[PDB]
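ARCHIVE RECORD
Type: protein–small molecule complex
Small molecule: 3PE
Source of inputs: curated submission
Record status: active
Notes field left blank by submitter.
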Amino acid sequence: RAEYVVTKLDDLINWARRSSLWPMTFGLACCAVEMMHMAAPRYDMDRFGVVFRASPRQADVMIVAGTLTNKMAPALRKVYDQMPEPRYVVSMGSCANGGGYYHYSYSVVRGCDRIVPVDIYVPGCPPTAEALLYGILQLQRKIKREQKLKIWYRR
Amino acid sequence: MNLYTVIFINILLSLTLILVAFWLPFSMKFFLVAITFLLFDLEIALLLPLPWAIQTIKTSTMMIMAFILVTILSLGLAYEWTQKGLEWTE
Amino acid sequence: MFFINILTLLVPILIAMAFLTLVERKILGYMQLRKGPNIVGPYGILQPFADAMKLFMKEPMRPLTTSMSLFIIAPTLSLTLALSLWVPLPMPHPLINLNLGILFILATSSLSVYSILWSGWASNSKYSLFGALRAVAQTISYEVTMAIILLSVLLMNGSYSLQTLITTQEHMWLLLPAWPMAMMWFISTLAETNRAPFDLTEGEYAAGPFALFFMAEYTNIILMNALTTIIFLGPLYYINLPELYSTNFMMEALLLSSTFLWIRASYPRFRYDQLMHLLWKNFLPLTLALCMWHISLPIFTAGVPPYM
Amino acid sequence: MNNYIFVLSSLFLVGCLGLALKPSPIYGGLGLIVSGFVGCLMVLGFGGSFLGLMVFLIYLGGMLVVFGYTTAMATEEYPETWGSNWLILGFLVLGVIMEVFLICVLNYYDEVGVINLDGLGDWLMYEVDDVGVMLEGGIGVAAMYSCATWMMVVAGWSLFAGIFIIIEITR
Amino acid sequence: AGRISAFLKNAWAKEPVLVVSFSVWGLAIIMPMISPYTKYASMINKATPYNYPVPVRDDGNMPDVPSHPQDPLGPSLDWLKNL
Amino acid sequence: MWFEILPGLAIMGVCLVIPGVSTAYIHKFTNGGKEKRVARVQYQWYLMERDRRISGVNRYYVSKGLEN
Amino acid sequence: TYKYVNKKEQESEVDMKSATDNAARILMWTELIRGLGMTLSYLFREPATINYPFEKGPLSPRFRGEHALRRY
Amino acid sequence: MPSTFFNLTMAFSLSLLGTLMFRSHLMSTLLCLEGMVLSLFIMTSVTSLNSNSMSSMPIPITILVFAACEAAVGLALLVKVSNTYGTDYVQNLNLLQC
Ligand SMILES: CCCCCCCCCCCCCCCCCC(=O)OC[C@H](COP(=O)(O)OCCN)OC(=O)CCCCCCCCCCCCCCCCC
Ligand SMILES: CCCCCCCCCCCCCCCCCC(=O)OC[C@H](COP(=O)(O)OCCN)OC(=O)CCCCCCCCCCCCCCCCC
Ligand code: SF4
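STRUCTURE (tokenized, with ligand):
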């Protein structure tokens, strides 16, 4: 059936999109040294296919790492808009998950999920590079579990 | 015919790739640089026929003229140098 | 048969670029005390196909203030030249046997400035135009020595043909003589290809165009190293063993293309002003001096070469 | 292939027509580049290997390059030019057709005169040494170094003095 | 001698590239007069037969020109081999 | 370890060796087991056209020899 | 107690020997081949990388991760 | 030969027409001048190759050199005009009428 080949086509597209993840590392604060340590040898970001840091204009995933303020939210939103679909976002840290240690402040956004839509939340202050890697692989699986062509076919 | 075929093929391949791509889903320093490059590229034009000139009999003459070319080119370079034409410190 | 020869020439060089990407990544990793790609396929041999699929499957956010004409014909031109350069190369017998072949190389290399400049003038900004002007000036400046070096080294073989260098080095490389001309030629290949430490233009395009630019870049890299091998490192040519010639040529070209990445990982970048000072104050004087030296050498020596 | 050189010369004509009509200093550069490519092609057709490759490597790689360079750095594109660009493209079409009618009338008025359409593929090469070596164009362009050294000194002096002239003009 | 030699050492330290350029310039302009192997270049490029040697009539008075390629009355470039 | 870049180095090496030997073999095949004759000047072109004319099958590489 | 960085104990010698040594350093590109050698040495070592989901990084009995409410 | 020469002369004439008819720019005139240069280069090389006169090949080289120099000085003048007025326009050179 066409269903078989369509499933295989979606699987191939998702394999590519998940094996060639390129991150825009919107690194604001002390949840970025861990991303650096994850690129470092012991974890070798580049080993799964995730380049160290590419340009925000040809990137696929976007890692929000650290406290997002009300003076920095518009630039993050502009970057998200400039980014090309299909684009995914990963929130690394308490600061970006809910504001964290500054949630009750006047110059902090209580969650990057108010400025942009998020796919994977990584908890920690800071979360080890191992946890960030776990989260990126969780994103890989979230991608592998897509059915775009199937939903366009049975429409 | 063969060169034509090869270049046509390359052009077709490039356009095909770039179609699939869409169908799947003032400072005077730069001017002076360009001018210097002109004045050296024309020297290349005057210098390229040496592999045919060194086959002649008037070796004492080709030696001379090539040395003249290179020497006066080096002098023009040195003057553009002394006059601060290779600096970039606006 | 000729179309089959064209396929045999084009397909492998594209595969070789796609895998030179991976070789770069792995070498840089192991020099940085890491592995590089290991997963997508055995040792990573599927990562380039994965990346190609990803890019060509993305969605192109074409700048609105632009011109589609210059947006499409820039990478088309880049790839066309990067492929048409490989044509005259004797490996050992060439697909197209030209006289004035190195001149065809010079010209079809100098023709890329047009794309690297139209892209900038198309992108409606001032920063992109600044970068484009600077890169054009760099490429231009280094073309001068790229030309004079050959102009002076083509007097040990009195012809602009590439099929004469084989017999010119039938007994000894053209490196022992002109090793000061190579050291200046090996570098102008970096600055010409905007390769580190001369990457002041990549240190603004959609998926497909960026991919074509990447292809052109790495193809030009392999080709410049191939020219180095053919000119200054003349391989073995036993009339009956084109296989031997091709093996040695491949080995040396891979050595050189790995040296480029060795360098990228080993050294810092340059500053545009210092990069231009380099040429206009160290390479051009020595180049002209050695040009005079090599015009005189075949005379005060009786070793002036022939015109066949 | 009898129509080869004629097609090339016609493309050169159209390029120079797109120059005469002045779209902008950048599309004019593209037209110049096309015309020069075609000029080299026809020179090679007539046997000028060195001349054509020199055109390639110097006129395009050296002259039109700085033309576009100076254009970008010292020129601004104004929005009006687009409607007028379309207008002059229509003008170019009309000029092409007028030239076709011109050529027709000239063939009707001079069969073996202006253009011998019957003898198009002919009258390209008149004579050639069949058993002759040493008859390319480099053998002539390299005369300069033995005979006609006067031309070489002239050109070298022009280039030399151009340095001083440009530094004094820009300053 | 001392002052100029100190100048040359200062250069040799500061800008060896200029020194090398100028010295190669001098070598180029000088060696072709020292060398004995220079003349041979013109000799060879003359000896190369890119054309047909159109013969001449045997009008009697021409003893120093041969009637066959294999006669010793004409030039003989054994010096090229011995070179 | 350092011996894991070879899976790619050798791939590229094979892809860079193919052009040369492919062209050589195709030349030997299309030109009668002989190299493709080059023509840098008009003399060689004349020799080639002459061989072609004396062949009798309109092919420059059909050498005839003494028998004819 | 202090030290000096980028200060020489005294002037140098302009001897032909040292001048030629510096000119060799400049022309022959000497101080850069050593960096190339460092990179080659690192290429010929063992990387510190680990298969993550199969090989895990080492921790301590004091690690502070996820929370838990205990029992008796 | 006759046809290509007729077309080359027509092209030179068209480029001279462009020069003598300004259209508010100056680059669009320098480019017509360079088109003229190119046409003359081509005609000269073609006549040389047709007549087999290898004692006339330096002529294209010389004219190319000198056209390059002319273009360089013209570009410099255009650069000054822009630096002063802001545009490579020709209505701004309305001085000297007094
Ligand atoms: C929309 C995208 C646009 C992008 C397009 C970019 C295309 C650029 C491609 C690179 C340009 C390559 C330039 C080709 C020059 C050829 C020079 C040459 O050496 O050929 C000469 C050839 C052999 O002569 P020779 O070597 O002297 O001696 C032979 C005797 N045995 O003798 C000959 O003369 C062979 C016949 C000439 C063949 C040349 C054809 C070149 C390819 C044509 C490209 C056409 C593209 C479309 C039109 C361009 C715009 C108008
Ligand atoms: C018969 C007797 C006489 C015969 C005449 C000839 C005699 C010999 C003449 C000597 C020739 C010397 C060699 C020629 C090249 C020299 C160029 C040079 O020296 O560049 C200088 C420049 C630094 O200059 P500067 O900034 O002033 O120095 C710092 C001041 N403290 O240095 C640089 O900036 C260079 C930048 C290099 C960056 C990249 C380095 C990568 C190196 C990779 C290895 C390459 C090895 C060669 C590969 C060969 C290719 C096959
Ligand atoms: S969550 Fe903690 S470690 Fe991360 S950015 Fe905020 S304060 Fe820094």
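CURATOR ANNOTATION: Chain B touches chain C at residues 2-3, 5-7, 9-11, 13-15, 17-18, 20-22, 24-25, 30, 33-34, 36-37, 40-41, 44, 47-48, 50-52, 54-55, 59, 63, 66-67, 70, 73-74, 77, 81, 86, 88-89 (CB under 8 Å).
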